[PDB]
Amino acid sequence: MAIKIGINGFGRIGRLVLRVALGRKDIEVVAVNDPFIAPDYAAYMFKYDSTHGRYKGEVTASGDDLVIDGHKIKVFQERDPANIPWGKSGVDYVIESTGVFTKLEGAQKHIDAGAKKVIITAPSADAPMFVVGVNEDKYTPDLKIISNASCTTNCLAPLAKVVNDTFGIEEGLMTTVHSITPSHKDWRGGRTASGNIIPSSTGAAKAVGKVIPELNGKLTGMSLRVPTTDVSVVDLTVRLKKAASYEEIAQAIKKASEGPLKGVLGYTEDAVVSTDFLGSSYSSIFDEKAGILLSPTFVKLISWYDNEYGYSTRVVDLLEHVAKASA
Amino acid sequence: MAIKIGINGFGRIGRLVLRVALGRKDIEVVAVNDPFIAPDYAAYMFKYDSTHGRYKGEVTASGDDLVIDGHKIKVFQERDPANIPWGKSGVDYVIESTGVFTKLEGAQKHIDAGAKKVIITAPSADAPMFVVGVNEDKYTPDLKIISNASCTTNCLAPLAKVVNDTFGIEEGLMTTVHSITATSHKDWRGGRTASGNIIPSSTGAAKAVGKVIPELNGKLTGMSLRVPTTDVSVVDLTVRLKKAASYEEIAQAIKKASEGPLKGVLGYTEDAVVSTDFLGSSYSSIFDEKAGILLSPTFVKLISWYDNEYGYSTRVVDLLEHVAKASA
Amino acid sequence: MAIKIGINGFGRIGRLVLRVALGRKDIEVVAVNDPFIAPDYAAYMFKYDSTHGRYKGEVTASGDDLVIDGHKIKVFQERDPANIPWGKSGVDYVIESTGVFTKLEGAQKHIDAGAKKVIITAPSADAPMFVVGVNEDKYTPDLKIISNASCTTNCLAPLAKVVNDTFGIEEGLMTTVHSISHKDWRGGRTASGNIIPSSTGAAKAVGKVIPELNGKLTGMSLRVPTTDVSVVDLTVRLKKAASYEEIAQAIKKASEGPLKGVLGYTEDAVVSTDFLGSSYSSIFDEKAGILLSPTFVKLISWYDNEYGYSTRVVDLLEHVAKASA
Amino acid sequence: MAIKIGINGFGRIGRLVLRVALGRKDIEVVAVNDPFIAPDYAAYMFKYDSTHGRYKGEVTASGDDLVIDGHKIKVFQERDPANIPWGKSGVDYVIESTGVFTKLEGAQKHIDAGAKKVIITAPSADAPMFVVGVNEDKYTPDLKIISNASCTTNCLAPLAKVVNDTFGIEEGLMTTVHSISHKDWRGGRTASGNIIPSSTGAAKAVGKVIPELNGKLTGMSLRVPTTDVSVVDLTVRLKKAASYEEIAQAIKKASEGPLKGVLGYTEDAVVSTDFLGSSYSSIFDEKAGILLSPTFVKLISWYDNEYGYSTRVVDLLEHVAKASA
């Protein structure tokens, strides 16, 4: 065997990872660390704000433990990760879902405190990134601290993985219309999101060059925040090396959707809207009808994704691959 | 001495055109035709349904007329454009904002009803299209029915002009994020709830630019992403250039044209702006300089804002005055 | 044994009833009728707009059938309800969900076409109205054409019953905030970014479902741009004095007894989306209510628009069949 | 004659009161205090003033000052309100628009820094409370720290005054539809796509500005995903019997004389965004209110959140600083 894991931080990603981890039989959530929230408040946010609607099952809160469908889960309140008793409770893998310890120096504190491997759920500035379905086969057991990139990257990287392997991506620009999911001169972010299209920035397109090195330096992108929530979409516009018709691009994306990228890269040919993909375990759903082709080497591809939901499943997928590779 | 005009249809487009024509001294409105609405219902839609703030002015509805700041507007409920008396009212120009008679077969019903030239405020595969700032100079007086394209086309064409005139447009894939505008199985996605939903849809705006810019014919196609917002939309143009350049050369070319040939039509800004920052703007296209990306010296993505039909409606009044000046 | 039903109109309510009916074994949906949509279009709206998000099941369409998880359902396209082959299809009950044949004369056309009884999923101006949990026991088998009231009425009537039964309602004003050329000029305004005050006879219709409250209950509506989750705000003057604890404790007792599955009771810091896909007809919000005097209180109750209402339609359908035979 | 003021905090309320302050001819803004923001960042937020449109004036940021229409306004970044050079800058009145220094022990630091009087733009548990048009004439110059309550209170108090003066309010329950140790858990939820019930406490605040209604009004709030304008739903029990026409006529006559400017009256089919930018404190919706009994009515009134409130702050400032009004 049972993979004894632990989760630092109990936010949107931390709660979504816990729900998926509780559904896996070979994974045992031993403890959770969050110094800000109380055990009863953690049960409230997991009851109503884990998945859409509310969780279906008994969720209680003991004096210092979360009881979710009988599974007693210890809760710690340590603001410094080096004080979390990962060793005493027997936690091997720590899912870093705080967004503040996203570098090797910070994530190492979990390893110093009794843990072995640390998987952070955010783009890192020094830890090797890994995207399930794209470069998880490149993982080797010597990597103690890795990363699973962000929301958009887990949607763009599989789509770009298929188009690059079949036709070759010469260069590509991306615009991701992002849902609600002043830190460094970000004046546009301080504006109210309600009733506002806010052009922001993301490093997802460049981070793709890190999970598939062939595309390094070949992709840039920006974001357009919209007042809606739940589901975001990726608008990839690339120049191809090999000419093609749209029918050949969609059938290549579909061929991988049913084979190697099963469960990660979805495919559809229906008149779908954003709310059709809420609660989807997919990381990227290609919209065949939405895409348009202007020349046999210049096409625009569109892919949906439900923010942190399908992403949080890939964290659990990556956790099992890293634990399996250490056998 | 005054352009005696008239508006067929009192919708969101027609009410904004009536609002701009009053400010212009050379344009006088005398009649408004709308079958399904009443004069008192029209005074309510002009005062309040103008989704900005509120029309700061007295808006009264007489027995059969519309009083706005002391100006009488004869309201007609003719369901057929072949029965609205344009000649008895002396309205030489007709603004077709119904969106139903967007062809020469229907627009001619305004001509043989006493009026001279009628301009349709919607794309027309039957009538020649025109965009103020691009192909507006190629207007000829013998042409009696012209089209002012759509609000999206009036945003892409001014931008795609200065980019093609300076660097030359090779290809161009467009994405227009559109907010709530205005309205049978030709659009399944359209029959979905707009609230809390991202709805992709097609648009012929990029293909329409190929008509107002004959060089770009066949090099610009696009699609739309409807979002639940209100009066503000944006254009995400990804173009391959014919000549290598830097981003500051592209921004300086747009900034230069915004200060000269496209003054008032094409806007330029370098501020960290959001959508609501352009509420009620008279520009039809406003370039966002800080938002653009240059991946390679021939591969760029440009961003331009536009306030839906408001910047489009004031453009109809500009093209209308051009027809009067061209009537030699 | 297994009741054979049919659905008129394939809109939001007709789709939600078909979904709940498929989940129950005692009901067998034989056919649907909608003269405006094609079979492939009815399958599209059922796949991506019946269940919130996406339906968990295969939804295809053949020539004149709507195959949903293997079960074939005939599809008619009759504008006149009297031309619908209900008799030869074996359908005994018709679910009138179009919203235009909501009177006795109009709904009769289903009976003229071979059906036995019709249930209108809308308030009716002449057909008898019944709400599950309030006056469902007042139904007699001789009633052929009944109404299931509104979705708002199905939220106010359960709450108003327990408050009137335990403490008695002297008077009561309510206000429901409803989530997403004409006679009313506010309805023509854009719903995006607007709180539009509208109106409904939901409170006056409570008098038809509990005759005591007839004439001493009225309210209005405030439309909000939210998505398919509304909440009723009821302000009543009580006849018997009480504390807020005693009002909430009684609502809880009925939620765990006679009104189980219909009236819900919560004490948590819940929000709109917490009742997404909720099977209840109304959920009392204990923390939201406030008491001013011992006989003057304000109560809050949520409901997921037409979801719990459609489950209630299926509930009323099985009760009528329970009483018809 | 001329008064010199300063604004502590540069949030939405602080930015709105600054705009109305520049419009008047008597008040001259001297300096603004904000430790988190910068002078260059302050010009960016004031030029794009949230949901009110772009400012029609040259708003540039100089070296250490902020320039609007040529007027140079100093900017201080002192985190402590006692270390702000209000006296060295010649500031007399401090507009506490922060929300943290609402008590007397906190607001009096501005007095120790060189100012003479402080007006808090938030309901205070220690400072006396005033609402223009309701109890502004009861201000005595010996009061150096006062508050103008909340923007919700400025919508109910002028309405409750007119109803109570003519018909008398026995009891009143309120519900306001709001737009935009853990205490409130609902507040920590996503505002978009959610109706979030909250507690405003504005009705009990009317007991301070109207001592007669003390203990007769309590309310709650419903936060909806919108902006611009909010609404107030008042359900009062009257003392004297009256019809809805008598109530509407009493409000209309009040809004044309003693409350000309603060209270508004409309009979049109209005919506939310129709009051975007209204300087009124309350707009009675005559076409929306209903009457169940001659002494049991439900009144609805609109208010444009912080806009009219901020205008009402400058009215209180000139009323306090000058005896002419």
From Swiss-Prot, chain A:
User: Which residues are listed for D-glyceraldehyde 3-phosphate binding in this entry?
Assistant: S150, C151, T152, T181, T202, G203, R225
Location of this chain's protein in the cell: Cytoplasm; Secreted, Cell wall
Residues annotated as the enzyme's active site: C151
MF annotations from Gene Ontology: glyceraldehyde-3-phosphate dehydrogenase (NAD+) (phosphorylating) activity; NAD binding; NADP binding
Key words of the record: Cell wall, Cell wall biogenesis/degradation, Cytoplasm, Glycolysis, NAD, Oxidoreductase, Secreted
Query: Which EC numbers does the record give?
Result: 1.2.1.12
Task: Give me the reactions it catalyses.
Answer: D-glyceraldehyde 3-phosphate + phosphate + NAD(+) = (2R)-3-phospho-glyceroyl phosphate + NADH + H(+)
Q: InterPro entries from the entry?
A: GlycerAld/Erythrose_P_DH (IPR020831), GlycerAld_3-P_DH_AS (IPR020830), GlycerAld_3-P_DH_cat (IPR020829), GlycerAld_3-P_DH_NAD(P)-bd (IPR020828), Glyceraldehyde-3-P_DH_1 (IPR006424), NAD(P)-bd_dom_sf (IPR036291)
Signal peptide boundaries:
none
Among SUPFAM superfamilies, the record links this protein to: Glyceraldehyde-3-phosphate dehydrogenase-like, C-terminal domain, NAD(P)-binding Rossmann-fold domains
**Pathway assigned in UniProt:** Carbohydrate degradation; glycolysis; pyruvate from D-glyceraldehyde 3-phosphate: step 1/5
Quick one: which residues bind NAD(+)? R12, I13, D34, R79, N307
- Site for Activates thiol group during catalysis, residues: H178
The record's principal subcellular location, in a coarse class, is cytoplasm
**EC primary class:** oxidoreductase
Judging by the UniProt lineage, the source's domain of life is Eukaryota
Question: Gene Ontology terms, cellular component aspect?
Answer: cytosol; extracellular region
Q: Alphabetically, which GO biological process terms does the record hold?
A: cell wall organization; glucose metabolic process; glycolytic process
| Similarity annotation | Belongs to the glyceraldehyde-3-phosphate dehydrogenase family.
Q: How does it assemble?
A: Homotetramer.
Entry's PANTHER family? GLYCERALDEHYDE 3-PHOSPHATE DEHYDROGENASE, GLYCERALDEHYDE-3-PHOSPHATE DEHYDROGENASE-RELATED
Listed name of the protein: Glyceraldehyde-3-phosphate dehydrogenase
